[PDB]
Amino acid sequence: GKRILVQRRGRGGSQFRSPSWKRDGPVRYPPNISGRGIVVEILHEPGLNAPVAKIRMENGVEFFNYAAEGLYVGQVIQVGPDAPPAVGNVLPLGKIPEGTMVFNVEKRFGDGGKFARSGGTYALVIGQRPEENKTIVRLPSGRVIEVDARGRATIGIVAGGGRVEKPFVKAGKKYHRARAKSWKYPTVRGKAMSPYAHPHGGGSHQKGGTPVPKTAPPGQKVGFIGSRCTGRGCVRARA
Amino acid sequence: PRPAYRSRSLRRVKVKTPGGRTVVHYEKRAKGVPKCAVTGQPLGGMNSKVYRFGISTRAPSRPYGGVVSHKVLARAIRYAVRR
Amino acid sequence: MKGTPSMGKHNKGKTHIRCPRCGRHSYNVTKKYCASCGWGRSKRWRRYNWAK
Amino acid sequence: ARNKPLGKKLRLAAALNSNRNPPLWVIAKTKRRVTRSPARRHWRRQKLKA
RNA sequence: UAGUAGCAGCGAAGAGGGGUGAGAAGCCCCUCCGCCGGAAAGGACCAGGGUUUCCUGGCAACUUCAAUAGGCCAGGAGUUAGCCGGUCCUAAGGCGGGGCCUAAUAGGCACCCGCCGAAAGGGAAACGGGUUAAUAUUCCCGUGCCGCGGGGGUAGGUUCUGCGGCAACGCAGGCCCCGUCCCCGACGCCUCGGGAUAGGGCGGGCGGGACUGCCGUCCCGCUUAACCGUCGAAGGCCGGGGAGUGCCGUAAUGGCGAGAACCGGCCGAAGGCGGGAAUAGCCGGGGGUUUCCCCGGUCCGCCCGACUCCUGGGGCCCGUGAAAAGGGGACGGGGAACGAGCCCCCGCGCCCGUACCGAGAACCGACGCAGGUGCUCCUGGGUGAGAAGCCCAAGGCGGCUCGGGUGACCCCGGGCCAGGGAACUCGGCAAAUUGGCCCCGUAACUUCGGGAGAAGGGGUGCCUGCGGUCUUGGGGUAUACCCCCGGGACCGCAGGUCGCAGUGGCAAGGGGGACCUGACUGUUUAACAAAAACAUAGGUCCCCGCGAGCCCGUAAGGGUGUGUACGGGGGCUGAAUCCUGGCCACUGGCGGUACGUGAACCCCGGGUACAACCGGGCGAAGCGCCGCUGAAGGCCGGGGGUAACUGACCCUCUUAAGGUAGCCAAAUGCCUUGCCGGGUAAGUUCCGGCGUGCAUGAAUGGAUCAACGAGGUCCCCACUGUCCCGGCCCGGGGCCCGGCGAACCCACCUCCAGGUGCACAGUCCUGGGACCCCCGACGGGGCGAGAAGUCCCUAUGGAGCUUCACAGCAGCCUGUCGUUGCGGGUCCGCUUACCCGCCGCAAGGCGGGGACAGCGGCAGGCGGGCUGUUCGGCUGGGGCGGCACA
RNA sequence: GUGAAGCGGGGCGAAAGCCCCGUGGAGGCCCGAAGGGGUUCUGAUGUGCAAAUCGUUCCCAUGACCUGGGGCUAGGGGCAAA
RNA sequence: GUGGGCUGGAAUGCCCCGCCGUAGAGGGUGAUAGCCCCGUAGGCGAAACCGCCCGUGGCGGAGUCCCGGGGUCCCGGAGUACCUCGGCUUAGUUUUGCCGGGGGAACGCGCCGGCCACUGGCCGGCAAGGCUAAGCACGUCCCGAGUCCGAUAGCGCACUAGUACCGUGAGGGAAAGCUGAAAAGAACCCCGGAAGGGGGGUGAAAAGAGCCUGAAACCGGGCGGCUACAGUGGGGCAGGCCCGAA
RNA sequence: UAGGCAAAGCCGCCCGGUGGAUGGCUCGGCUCGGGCGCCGAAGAAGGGCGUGGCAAGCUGCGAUAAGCCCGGGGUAGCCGCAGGCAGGCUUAGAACCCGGGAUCCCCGAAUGGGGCUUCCUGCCGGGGCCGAAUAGGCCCCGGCGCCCCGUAAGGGGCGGGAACGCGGGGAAAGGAAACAUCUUAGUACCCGCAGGAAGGGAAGCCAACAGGGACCCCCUGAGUAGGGGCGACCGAAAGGGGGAUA
Numbered sequence A: 001g002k003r004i005l006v007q008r009r010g011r012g013g014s015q016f017r018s019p020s021w022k023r024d025g026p027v028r029y030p031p032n033i034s035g036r037g038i039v040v041e042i043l044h045e046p047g048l049n050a051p052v053a054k055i056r057m058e059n060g061v062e063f064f065n066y067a068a069e070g071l072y073v074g075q076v077i078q079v080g081p082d083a084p085p086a087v088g089n090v091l092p093l094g095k096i097p098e099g100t101m102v103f104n105v106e107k108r109f110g111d112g113g114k115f116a117r118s119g120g121t122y123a124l125v126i127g128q129r130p131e132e133n134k135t136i137v138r139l140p141s142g143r144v145i146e147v148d149a150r151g152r153a154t155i156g157i158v159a160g161g162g163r164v165e166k167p168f169v170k171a172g173k174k175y176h177r178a179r180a181k182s183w184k185y186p187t188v189r190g191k192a193m194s195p196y197a198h199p200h201g202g203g204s205h206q207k208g209g210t211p212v213p214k215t216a217p218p219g220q221k222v223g224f225i226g227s228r229c230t231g232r233g234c235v236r237a238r239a
Numbered sequence B: 001p002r003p004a005y006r007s008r009s010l011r012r013v014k015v016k017t018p019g020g021r022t023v024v025h026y027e028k029r030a031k032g033v034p035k036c037a038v039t040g041q042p043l044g045g046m047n048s049k050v051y052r053f054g055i056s057t058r059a060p061s062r063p064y065g066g067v068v069s070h071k072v073l074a075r076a077i078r079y080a081v082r083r
Numbered sequence C: 001m002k003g004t005p006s007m008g009k010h011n012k013g014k015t016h017i018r019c020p021r022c023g024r025h026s027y028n029v030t031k032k033y034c035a036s037c038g039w040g041r042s043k044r045w046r047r048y049n050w051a052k
Numbered sequence D: 001a002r003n004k005p006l007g008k009k010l011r012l013a014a015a016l017n018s019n020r021n022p023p024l025w026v027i028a029k030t031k032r033r034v035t036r037s038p039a040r041r042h043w044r045r046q047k048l049k050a
Numbered sequence E: 001u002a003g004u005a006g007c008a009g010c011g012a013a014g015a016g017g018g019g020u021g022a023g024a025a026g027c028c029c030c031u032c033c034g035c036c037g038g039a040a041a042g043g044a045c046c047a048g049g050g051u052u053u054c055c056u057g058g059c060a061a062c063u064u065c066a067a068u069a070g071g072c073c074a075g076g077a078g079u080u081a082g083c084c085g086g087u088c089c090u091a092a093g094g095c096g097g098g099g100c101c102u103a104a105u106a107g108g109c110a111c112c113c114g115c116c117g118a119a120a121g122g123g124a125a126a127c128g129g130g131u132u133a134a135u136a137u138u139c140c141c142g143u144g145c146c147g148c149g150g151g152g153g154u155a156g157g158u159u160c161u162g163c164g165g166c167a168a169c170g171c172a173g174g175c176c177c178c179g180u181c182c183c184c185g186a187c188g189c190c191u192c193g194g195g196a197u198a199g200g201g202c203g204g205g206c207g208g209g210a211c212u213g214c215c216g217u218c219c220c221g222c223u224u225a226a227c228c229g230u231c232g233a234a235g236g237c238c239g240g241g242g243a244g245u246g247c248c249g250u251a252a253u254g255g256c257g258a259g260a261a262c263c264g265g266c267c268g269a270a271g272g273c274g275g276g277a278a279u280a281g282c283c284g285g286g287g288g289u290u291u292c293c294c295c296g297g298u299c300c301g302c303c304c305g306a307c308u309c310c311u312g313g314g315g316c317c318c319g320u321g322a323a324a325a326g327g328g329g330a331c332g333g334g335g336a337a338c339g340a341g342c343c344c345c346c347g348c349g350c351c352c353g354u355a356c357c358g359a360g361a362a363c364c365g366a367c368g369c370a371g372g373u374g375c376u377c378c379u380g381g382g383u384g385a386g387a388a389g390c391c392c393a394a395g396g397c398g399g400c401u402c403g404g405g406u407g408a409c410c411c412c413g414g415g416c417c418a419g420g421g422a423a424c425u426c427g428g429c430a431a432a433u434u435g436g437c438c439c440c441g442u443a444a445c446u447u448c449g450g451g452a453g454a455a456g457g458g459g460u461g462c463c464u465g466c467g468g469u470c471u472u473g474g475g476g477u478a479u480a481c482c483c484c485c486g487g488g489a490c491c492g493c494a495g496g497u498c499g500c501a502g503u504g505g506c507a508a509g510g511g512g513g514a515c516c517u518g519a520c521u522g523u524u525u526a527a528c529a530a531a532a533a534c535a536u537a538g539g540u541c542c543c544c545g546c547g548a549g550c551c552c553g554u555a556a557g558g559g560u561g562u563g564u565a566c567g568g569g570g571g572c573u574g575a576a577u578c579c580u581g582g583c584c585a586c587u588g589g590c591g592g593u594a595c596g597u598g599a600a601c602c603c604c605g606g607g608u609a610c611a612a613c614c615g616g617g618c619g620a621a622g623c624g625c626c627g628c629u630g631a632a633g634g635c636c637g638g639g640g641g642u643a644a645c646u647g648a649c650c651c652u653c654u655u656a657a658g659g660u661a662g663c664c665a666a667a668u669g670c671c672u673u674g675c676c677g678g679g680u681a682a683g684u685u686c687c688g689g690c691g692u693g694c695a696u697g698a699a700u701g702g703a704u705c706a707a708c709g710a711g712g713u714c715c716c717c718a719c720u721g722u723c724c725c726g727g728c729c730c731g732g733g734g735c736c737c738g739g740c741g742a743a744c745c746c747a748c749c750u751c752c753a754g755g756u757g758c759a760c761a762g763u764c765c766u767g768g769g770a771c772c773c774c775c776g777a778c779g780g781g782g783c784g785a786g787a788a789g790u791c792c793c794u795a796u797g798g799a800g801c802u803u804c805a806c807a808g809c810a811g812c813c814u815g816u817c818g819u820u821g822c823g824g825g826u827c828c829g830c831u832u833a834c835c836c837g838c839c840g841c842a843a844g845g846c847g848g849g850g851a852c853a854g855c856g857g858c859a860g861g862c863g864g865g866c867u868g869u870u871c872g873g874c875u876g877g878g879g880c881g882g883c884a885c886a
Numbered sequence F: 001g002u003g004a005a006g007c008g009g010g011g012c013g014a015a016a017g018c019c020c021c022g023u024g025g026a027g028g029c030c031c032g033a034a035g036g037g038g039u040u041c042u043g044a045u046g047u048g049c050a051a052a053u054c055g056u057u058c059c060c061a062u063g064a065c066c067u068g069g070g071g072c073u074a075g076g077g078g079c080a081a082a
Numbered sequence G: 001g002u003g004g005g006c007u008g009g010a011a012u013g014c015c016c017c018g019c020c021g022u023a024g025a026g027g028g029u030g031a032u033a034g035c036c037c038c039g040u041a042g043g044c045g046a047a048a049c050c051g052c053c054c055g056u057g058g059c060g061g062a063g064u065c066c067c068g069g070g071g072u073c074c075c076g077g078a079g080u081a082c083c084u085c086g087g088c089u090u091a092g093u094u095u096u097g098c099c100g101g102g103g104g105a106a107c108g109c110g111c112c113g114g115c116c117a118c119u120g121g122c123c124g125g126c127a128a129g130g131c132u133a134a135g136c137a138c139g140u141c142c143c144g145a146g147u148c149c150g151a152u153a154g155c156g157c158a159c160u161a162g163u164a165c166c167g168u169g170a171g172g173g174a175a176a177g178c179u180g181a182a183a184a185g186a187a188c189c190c191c192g193g194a195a196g197g198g199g200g201g202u203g204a205a206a207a208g209a210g211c212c213u214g215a216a217a218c219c220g221g222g223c224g225g226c227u228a229c230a231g232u233g234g235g236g237c238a239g240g241c242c243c244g245a246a
Numbered sequence H: 001u002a003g004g005c006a007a008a009g010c011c012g013c014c015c016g017g018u019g020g021a022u023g024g025c026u027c028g029g030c031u032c033g034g035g036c037g038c039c040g041a042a043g044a045a046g047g048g049c050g051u052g053g054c055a056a057g058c059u060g061c062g063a064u065a066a067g068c069c070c071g072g073g074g075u076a077g078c079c080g081c082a083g084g085c086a087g088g089c090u091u092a093g094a095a096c097c098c099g100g101g102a103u104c105c106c107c108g109a110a111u112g113g114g115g116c117u118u119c120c121u122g123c124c125g126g127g128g129c130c131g132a133a134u135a136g137g138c139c140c141c142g143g144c145g146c147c148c149c150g151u152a153a154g155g156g157g158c159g160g161g162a163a164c165g166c167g168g169g170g171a172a173a174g175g176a177a178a179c180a181u182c183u184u185a186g187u188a189c190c191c192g193c194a195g196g197a198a199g200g201g202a203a204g205c206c207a208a209c210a211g212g213g214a215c216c217c218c219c220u221g222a223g224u225a226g227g228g229g230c231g232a233c234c235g236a237a238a239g240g241g242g243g244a245u246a
């Protein structure tokens, strides 16, 4: 037809969907975990970016968390406000001291954790405003945000860091990783297309496109989408 | 039947009958033996080859039997005795 | 290959079976309705005014 | 097929029963007017869509 | 047309005798000949087909010929299950109801509930022999198994608990009901050790068969199901022991006070063996007669050994290789006086499938079709690296459903060819060469891995002996070594000897140098393009902190997301290495103080007994304006003169700047066979240089070739029928005979010359010729046939794509009306509205935001994302031009 | 067939340290059957065996590999290493 | 009327002679029939089921009915009327109806309409609730008619046609009528392996089940003309051979 | 020289073979007019399968299966299309026609639950069978859809039908000699909902100072007013005459 690939992605086809049946479950904090727990397993999850620890609470509730680097099987973790700020412990942001490296941070209490969930990532506890029950934290991107002090986080940094430094040496390796992730692999460049299939397709000497405005409709909003700038000058202006 | 035998789920056993013929019998593979709930290793006294379900197996004469091994049971008993 | 060589692959598959309600070879086994009378997706009989 | 469902088997049985030319006494009764039957077929030529 | 084409090609084929019969090359039987034999071919079987299966009879029609034959026609018959499958479970997923959405439904689905979803996944339990024309784990005989239920005996129990062992753990381990937990179910790929079995072989024995020129060899049978019991390799574990001058090892990695050596013990495969069971089956020898009875044998000692079965060790993953039913155990609560997982005995197991093909004739392709589906799974001996090829078993076939004669040309496929050796030709196209294994040896360059089988050279048969390294059993003091005996594997030495030729058939790389190009493996236009195109790893930029960004939906809502910046989405570049220059003028994007402009709403004035109506004010985004941005799309000239082409000078124009590093007559250079070298006797191609380069140049990627290449090109050696130049031969078409028996094409049908004519006549004119008929061949003519020319133009004909065309519509942004409530002084606060997430079946609770947001209406902006259209005419054909268009 | 990491021995040094051999079994590695694909002859055929075939010559052949059954995506829409 | 004769296989035809007719609409019967038969004009008819009309019958209501006066008190239909914006529609045009967004009445002393709005007069009415027979559309079906077609026509189908069949499917879809009055459907003999052929029969006629008639193209045979030294078809004239019954 | 005298071949007539035209025929079609008009949970229409002594298709019927019972008409033949071979039924009144009943497999709104095979399967109650048994198992029959009304009992909707009717959503081709407003056209088509008809119907009317008097349908007003790139083209109403009358 004429609808482009980014428009076809939103339909939810099998080649664009995530095979989450390959995973044991969501890696989130259950709503009402408290007390001491035991690290029983550290497992690989297909398509995820870090090893996943299985924590067995003292009252029998078991949940999945991202494993802190240095966490080991048989370890005893503490959950709750009374938990000390040691590695693997799940503490409120309000109780966590400043300068602490946490991960799996909850923006609001009870969502399960949103930020610093990739391997080798972490958030830094910058400050505490207890009079509005907020915690200022720096996310992995360098952005400083306020989060609910009653929310929960884990002390330490996410294990599995350095996974992306090693090159994906063959196309087959990225193929096998894509089959576990949700990516459609591989991707055709826009200018390698014909004009019916992409705005960049067409001419005898095919060319890319200049940036489109932020108000551009779907099917037109490809390439640079309302970019502040492009290239090395843009990076320089950013820094 | 025939695609079920082309799949490798059953064992292909060649046998010579008293009539002098050679035939292929398709037999089930053995079921896995019970494992310890902590270590995952096979439990002693219960690792005989079993080929079908519904066969009652006799557990070793110990508390918790074919659930945990003697090592886990003894260590847990020591911890509970102190605790 | 699209002609005679591809015709040989139409020897073992099927899209439709006989419909229990109308008896035609029009019951879509995967979609689970009849393409002629609409049984399985419409309790009223499927018949359109554009068809003679 | 080796493995059949009963409904398909019964429809095949109906086709087997109907597949036959009219009897010779029927031909004599009709004075050679009724010679063929519409339900007559060959398995290789005309295919049931069972 | 025409009794013409075809009934050849794809590596099988028939012949003699007899019988039946009207009729026999073709049907039936024997003999001979041949083909397959990890299979266009033997065994099994899925889907699909559906009676094609079996028997009897037949030849009007069918089978590319025949027919007494048949997948054909007519008549009749045939498919037997507790244990083989479905049936059960869940997967990816789907359907229904409730609900929510919708003008509405037969449309949608995030929610709740139920169900469906595998004849290759998980998963109860059957095997051997015999029997029919046709079913055979289904029928019969024999021997068993599973589930459910019952009876008797027993161990056990009867307030309470089973017994033994240091332990691993062992042993009949009472009964009923309920709960919970755990485990099995339940899992990849690669690699190497060990153990078996199926199968195969060797020597001897018995029995039977094959051959008769010589020898006496060669072949066949000698089998053992499920089920019961017992044993148990690796591995794991228990007790003793208490080790560092270490000690113990493997195919390999290796192990030990975090407990080794060593001793004893426990759990524990395939499979073995006994029972089953010789009474079966088989080989041989007899008797009877409708398949029954009798007799003998069914053995001894070794060897190989799987792709089948079992087991353990090691390694790899930015890849981690399903779920549930069902089952087992344990841990607890409750109940009775009875009572088992042990032994004996009794009873029940419904429903559907079950024939046959499973394909060079049973499926699909109009066909009894060289295709496709399915070679999907399995297969003995020799040679051999081999599941290669060649030959032969078991088993099957001569039905890729025309036969005979002839031995012209010509065509298709194959063989050889003296001297020369690419002179052929666009081009070494085609063909030829090489070819296995062992030994020697191996360059530039390189990303240090490679290049590499580089290149180049030598050996290769058979026979007679002499040895070695292991392996597998048995016997010797004898577990390794040692000696003897039987079997197996591989390696070597000496001598002799034949040929033209010893990887003798089969099988089986030609090699080297250089340029361009794409890093590589991979993908692509099913049916004219396999590529330098796409992808790729790597690089880089942008939108995004999640109530995000992007996308889908009318909406309810959905995907990315069981996710979270080491992430999702969107562009460009395209391995690595050295690098990636100047420019924000334009086209975009984004940010902004002020100012102009800027729609609806609202406000003010006039008007109107009220309005319409008119004027003004306020004025959002946006535009104007100001900045940032080139790994955004991309651009990169000069004018000159001066001056020892200018190192240097002033600049100016300039759409902003004026092409840097590099590279080049390039797959980019018109002129142009550029100029200079090399190569050839002769070189428009090619290579190395030169460069004011029509019109090279930096992630629009520049330079760049190590490796890789069914890429494009030039050269060298070898090789040769490519060619000088043509010849001979082989199989099939061919020709002739018998049988079957079309099509294309066809106004009628045409000897030649020179004219004429809608300008290229069979038919007209003037001439020249021809006895008529038939066969073969060819392809000059019949502007030969096929196809209402795709090339060109016209039409006030289309379609798709583009945008700076004419319009329009979604989408996004912005203002406004409503939702919008309560206080306090346009501003602050509040929560109940509303929204967002968590818990909860629901009821409702928690937290955050908050009259904002979101949502509906209206209004403005951006808006080829999408819809509809228009892109005139004349014309020495159309187009450019011109207007000869008033 | 080649032989990565890892691992043993031998030779040579005062040492730091080099060389030789073996073991080991990595790889979108190499040659090559099945299997998949579709390059040349611009071969045969081209009213065909066939509305895309056949021969020959070829490319990949441990993986981004080939293949069966079940499932999802539908028309201005799908799917697309394009 | 089945009367007499003729023809004929068989008459309904022909010649002669009778009759009915409220019936001469039409069909069948061995050829053309008012009187042979079915029918037609006309008349009679249902155990059962169904429909319509008429008479009669049983019952209920709070006087709700009719006439006369009094009244000036009470009731009398809302997001409606109306205004504004957007849209679809309409002849509806500064003026049709409606839907959506926003605003939004009065009450009988009131409200609505009278082709732009308002004012006054005059005229006509009482929206925003519900029903209603008859008279009118259609054709699966039933009956009748026809300057309709007549087996390539007429419906795709005169017939074992929505059939055989085609496509995965939505869907698509043919060809195909006729013996004779009566089977009297061909006995019997010879040949043939058989289909079948000859002879011989039935029939008015082979009309022979491959069945009424039976054209042309086409093919075979007979006949007439030409036919191997002469280039073709059409016309006119002359001639050779052949036919020249009506 | 010519004839006897002829090859292959050509022309014309006759006969034959092929073929199925022509003509004649008609239990078929088509048009028009009139009537009549709903069926379904009491399980419909539609489909599958089956059903005949020899029976393949059509027709009919439904395991009681070209059929069973009752009544009326119809008397002597009958066993459909369909002309064969048998054997039967019927005068104790058949066949046949009309009215009323019985039977009425599986699927189908399909309705216990499923349905990738028109078949499979669950729970409850009753019954039967195997069995030593009262266990266990198997089989038969009945009930078990969703949404509603109702106190309950009980009831309603669902699907179908050639066309016609009502409400909603709603194009383009073509025309305008291009084309967008426009038209085509509120059409084709889609969704929903009824009846034998539907819809409409009883003045907040029309008129114009004279008066009509619910509604629908027909003739007219009339291609008039009016709408409209005022182009193509579109297009009333009041009034009058009728059908009918509430």
Ligand SMILES: [Mg+2]
Residues within 6 Å of the ligand: A014, A015, A016, A017, A178, A179, A181, A182, A183, A184
């Ligand atoms: Mg995917």
Ligand SMILES: [Mg+2]
Residues within 6 Å of the ligand: A192, A193, A194
């Ligand atoms: Mg392209």
Ligand SMILES: [Mg+2]
Residues within 6 Å of the ligand: A199, A220
């Ligand atoms: Mg664009």
Ligand SMILES: [Mg+2]
Residues within 6 Å of the ligand: A195, A196, A198, A199
């Ligand atoms: Mg576009």
Ligand SMILES: [Mg+2]
Residues within 6 Å of the ligand: A199, A200, A201, A202, A203, A206, A207, A208
């Ligand atoms: Mg472009």
Ligand SMILES: [Mg+2]
Residues within 6 Å of the ligand: B004
């Ligand atoms: Mg299975």
Ligand SMILES: [Mg+2]
Residues within 6 Å of the ligand: B009
């Ligand atoms: Mg398994």
Ligand SMILES: [Mg+2]
Residues within 6 Å of the ligand: C002
């Ligand atoms: Mg196609």
Ligand SMILES: [Mg+2]
Residues within 6 Å of the ligand: C014, C015, C030
């Ligand atoms: Mg399918």
Ligand SMILES: [Mg+2]
Residues within 6 Å of the ligand: D044
């Ligand atoms: Mg077929």
Ligand SMILES: [Mg+2]
Residues within 6 Å of the ligand: none
């Ligand atoms: Mg011949």
Ligand SMILES: [Mg+2]
Residues within 6 Å of the ligand: none
């Ligand atoms: Mg020939």
Ligand SMILES: [Mg+2]
Residues within 6 Å of the ligand: none
């Ligand atoms: Mg051979």
Ligand SMILES: [Mg+2]
Residues within 6 Å of the ligand: none
């Ligand atoms: Mg052979």
Ligand SMILES: [Mg+2]
Residues within 6 Å of the ligand: none
């Ligand atoms: Mg085979």
Ligand SMILES: [Mg+2]
Residues within 6 Å of the ligand: none
């Ligand atoms: Mg047969």
